[PDB]
Amino acid sequence: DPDELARRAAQVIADRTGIGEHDVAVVLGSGWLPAVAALGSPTTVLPQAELPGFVPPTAAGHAGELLSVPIGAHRVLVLAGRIHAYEGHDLRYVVHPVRAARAAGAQIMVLTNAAGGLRADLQVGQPVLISDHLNLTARSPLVGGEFVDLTDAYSPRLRELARQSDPQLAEGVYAGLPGPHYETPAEIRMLQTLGADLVGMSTVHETIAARAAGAEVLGVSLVTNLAAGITGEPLSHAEVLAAGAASATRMGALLADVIAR
Amino acid sequence: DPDELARRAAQVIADRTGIGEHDVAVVLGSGWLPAVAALGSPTTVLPQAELPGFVPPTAAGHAGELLSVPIGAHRVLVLAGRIHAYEGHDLRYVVHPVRAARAAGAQIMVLTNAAGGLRADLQVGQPVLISDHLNLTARSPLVGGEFVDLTDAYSPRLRELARQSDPQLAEGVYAGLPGPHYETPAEIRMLQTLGADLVGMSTVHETIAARAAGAEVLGVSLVTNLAAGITGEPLSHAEVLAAGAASATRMGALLADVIARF
Amino acid sequence: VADPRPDPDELARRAAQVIADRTGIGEHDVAVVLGSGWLPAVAALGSPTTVLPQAELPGFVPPTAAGHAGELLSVPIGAHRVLVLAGRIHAYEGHDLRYVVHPVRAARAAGAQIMVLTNAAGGLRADLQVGQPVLISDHLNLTARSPLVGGEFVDLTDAYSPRLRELARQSDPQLAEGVYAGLPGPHYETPAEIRMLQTLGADLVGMSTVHETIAARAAGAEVLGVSLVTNLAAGITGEPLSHAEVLAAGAASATRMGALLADVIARF
Ligand SMILES: O=c1[nH]cnc2c(Sc3ccccc3OCP(=O)(O)O)c[nH]c12
Ligand SMILES: O=c1[nH]cnc2c(Sc3ccccc3OCP(=O)(O)O)c[nH]c12
Ligand SMILES: O=c1[nH]cnc2c(Sc3ccccc3OCP(=O)(O)O)c[nH]c12
């Protein structure tokens, strides 16, 4: 049962961290690990694999670690790594970390990801606030009887708080696709026609599950590339990884400052 | 085998209703269930749970009802309560009511549903004829070697007969999505771009199955809410049940008067 | 009844071994998959040195179309040894995508560097005629599926090699190109769905190819895609044609396109 597995996970988290309740959770995606160094000093770090119901992250740069971090009056559950629908897991396992974080007390989820830019004026390494999403997976993490409203799924209030730390932050609609193949240029033109600004392979189900469980969501993409058929700056793979790591390191400090309110 | 479970269901329907043949079937959506109280004078009520093929092996709670209702010269099979794709069951169970009804002689399927309104002229509590659909589920109820042309899937002839009962009935394109989450405002703007007037969580597979089985389809949406991000108010299942309950007597009357014209 | 879930790479290796043994050819550098309406193309490719039933190869689900569909032919074309798969299986038949893309993976394991993937399609774009062959410039995968599993990534830029389209147009410079929308099927589209597909940039609509292209690119093969327009899509206006006119136009185009592919492959 998803709710009971979430309650068991939250019990182990409380016991292993010695913290009764974490009021904020952060899921770090691909390219986001460098944010850890700037978020704060962890009081506990443990493998996700030792938590009930957690399929260990396997994607390159997903540590598969949970960090407990004090940030002002807040106790922040940091999930360094997530699992993806393209790994073949039932969506109940994909959204279990978010349900476990809610059961551990998290009222606000920061969901981070890597994304393709669908606009030629986005830059590799640019952080982009998620204004909304397009679920283009033909799936839901919810079952019969769970009829959840996704108006303001990405809290306007949280984007406003982020812009108090960096008022220049861009925003965009994130298209969640199944993957794991990348898009054809014709698919990228279609996504622009459907009103998407960003493309990736996570987040939409985690957002739906977070809203169904009564949590507010702040979504942040790191643009790792311009999407198929959009020509962008000639960068080496080292320049792409370096630009991403520098933004992820800066965004850790920004998230710490925003969470601290 | 879907066709054989349909045939066995039709045999039991004939035996328990004492009616050899039903020429019309009505599927009542969430938001149309209360209309069963106001749709003619039912002579027989059968539990779907006692009919072959109706309940998925891992079905949740109690199955629905089937009623036999005389409406004009017609004997109507009314399916009160249905299986949705969002419950996770094979689409054979979503479309079994349509296939069982066809095997019992139904040449016309009235498929009803609740919908979010996208087109500006469509109001909460308005019945809307379905002109066409967008299947946005990436699924089909048909298996290999079952082909069907979906040109005029929603019989123009039946929409014209409905308009003899109420000549001001609007019509719109219905987008069938998986659900059960409601849409983001961004997804609603996308659906407007793709030409949807209505959004919901049923019907598209039942329509495909009906056409494949040789039945004509009338689709009727009740607008239970404006689509996400139009008012800015959140959406709830309570709105669908509330709009259905309030409209039940009107919608029952409409379905009776339209079916009488078939 | 149970699906054994064989490992794709090993099933492809074993299939390529049986293909080498039964054809007496160690390597096939080109593969051709002939879709619906494409059987007339077979004779113009050349004289086959081996013909065998697909069903006798490991991992091959037999195509449902019988006769000369469901065959593998080994055909010499210039300096090349060409693996011709007459018929395919479809996602609508309900099989796991590993079976849908297994023929392409088996062909790659037998040495195929280039895949020619042909299909039937409905025409959306105003200029397209029933019977017209159309080069695939790009695709829209509208199935919400992938034939790739966790950790397998592929860039689908130029999935349909511009080089191979240019070689096809050297053999017949009037060949049109268009974007193929791959749908699950097996129902055909409503007119409203077809107006949607036009908005999303599709010129052609069918029930195959997209997963085979993804699997081909992931395995390192170049792809040439060709649609035969068998019908105008739902709601698309055109001259009324009889069933006989439609079928005859297709068969004559398939014959010509067989000769064109023989000439193009000789220049690969
Ligand atoms: O162009 C692009 N198309 C589609 N997806 C992307 C991504 S995200 C991505 C891609 C492959 C694997 C994992 C990914 O994300 C993991 P997560 O951060 O969401 O946990 C970047 N660029 C593109
Ligand atoms: O705005 C909307 N978006 C998407 N679906 C809807 C529905 S339908 C619906 C909603 C909740 C639960 C079940 C529903 O369908 C059952 P049925 O009537 O088709 O049997 C109304 N409004 C919207
Ligand atoms: O209008 C159309 N809509 C959608 N699909 C089509 C097809 S393809 C097709 C249809 C039924 C069965 C199989 C099919 O594909 C065979 P293949 O050549 O890809 O192996 C033609 N016309 C339309």
Residue numbers in the entry:
A (entry chain B): 7 to 266, 269
B (entry chain A): 7 to 268
C (entry chain C): 1 to 268
Paper quotes:
The enzyme degrades (2′-deoxy)nucleosides based on 6-oxopurines to the corresponding purine bases and (2-deoxy)ribose-1-phosphate. Purine nucleoside phosphorylase (PNP) is a well-known molecular target with potential therapeutic applications in the treatment of T-cell malignancies and/or bacterial/parasitic infections.
To obtain information on the binding pose and interacting residues, crystal structures of recombinant MtPNP in complex with inhibitors 18c, 45b, and 45q were determined and refined to high resolution. Purine moiety forms direct hydrogen bonds with the sidechains of Glu189, two bonds with Asn231, and a water-mediated bond with the amine group of the Ala234 main chain. Positions of purine and phosphonate moieties are identical in all three protein-inhibitor structures, and differences in inhibitor position are observed in the central phenyl moiety. All crystallization experiments were performed at 18 °C. The crystal of MtPNP with 18c was obtained using the sitting-drop vapor diffusion technique set by Orynx8 robot (Douglas Instruments) in Swissci 96-well 3-drop plates (Molecular Dimensions). The reservoir solution of 30 μL volume contained 0.2 M magnesium chloride, 30% v/v PEG400, 1 mM Tellurium-Centered Anderson–Evans Polyoxotungstate (TEW), 0.1 M HEPES pH 7.5,54 and drop volume 300 nL, made by mixing equal volumes of the sample and precipitate.
